């Protein structure tokens, strides 16, 4: 009950803000407040160090590999984006190109299914989508859009279901607007304003695409999430029609307004559930047909990330633990302990091949203390 981790990586000298994993190689990338990115392996004790990435003007806040496994894309708070090219079957990562089109990047993300593609949003509200040349790793801009009038807090690709050439992105802003884009043309498909949500002010924070298996084939249903407790579930394939809208919490007197902030959203197709996690530490599991809460968990402190995986819900917390819940029962099974300060992000890894052996999943964290921890978790 103090540290049940398997191993760790602690080369960062400041907060570990982002963590990404290669789609096929046992390779982690973490980005930190020391303006560095470190590569290390996820299959050994202790991790093997695989290199340090340099060139940033600020803290690194995004690390993600492209879906096909070529290229690492990293972003920092001075607005720089760097592209490293995988060489020697992922054994060496060479800087291929870089850019700096904005003052500060909030969020990046590499498209889950279309090769060599990524998008990012900035504090000035702008939205950018790029592709990466397969041969030399050069940058190819698809679009640049300036519609949001405050910070572009999050983006999420949609219709990821339809092959290359169907490249669509939903972005949201603290100015209450939500926009969908055709990334290839830079065309704004629809834009949600206060007018569409009863005139409510709703500075958006979180976005999450629903699995098609839960929406009867619709590959464009997105749950949103504001910093004052507003949940909107929108149909991006029907002009952003609102499928659900509610305030998810009734705050207590003089309780923090940001306590209602929806920090993370995750869907479960298996259980027809959508979980949201709040700054006040509440975790709410919604039935995705009736949009009513099914289970409610309450953590000691702020939820920082939620992730459904098989029968479980994983939840990282700013108290420095990662909790694992039985998605069906609601029972706490297992808590990852050993961090001093908060867990800012995490990934979950499965054993690649079925060996007729049990083989546990791994949670690997991004710690505010500058430490990543590797946990083996039940079933």
Residue numbers in the entry: 53 to 431
Mind quoting what the paper says about this structure?
In the case of Sqt1, we were able to decipher the mode of L10-N peptide binding by X-ray crystallography. We conclude that the β-propeller domains of Sqt1 and Rrb1, which harbour the essential function of these proteins, recognize the very N-terminal residues of Rpl10 and Rpl3.
Subsequently, we could solve the structure of the S. cerevisiae Sqt1 WD-repeat β-propeller domain at 2.0 Å resolution by molecular replacement using the native ctSqt1.52C structure as the search model. Sqt1 and ctSqt1 share a high degree of overall structural conservation and mainly differ in three ctSqt1-specific insertions located in the loops connecting β-strands 1c-1d, 5c-5d and 7c-7d. Further Y2H assays showed that the predicted WD-repeat β-propeller domains of Sqt1 (53C construct, deletion of amino acids 1–52) and Rrb1 (60C construct, deletion of amino acids 2–59), which support wild-type growth, are sufficient to mediate the interaction both with full-length or the N-terminal residues of Rpl10 and Rpl3, respectively.
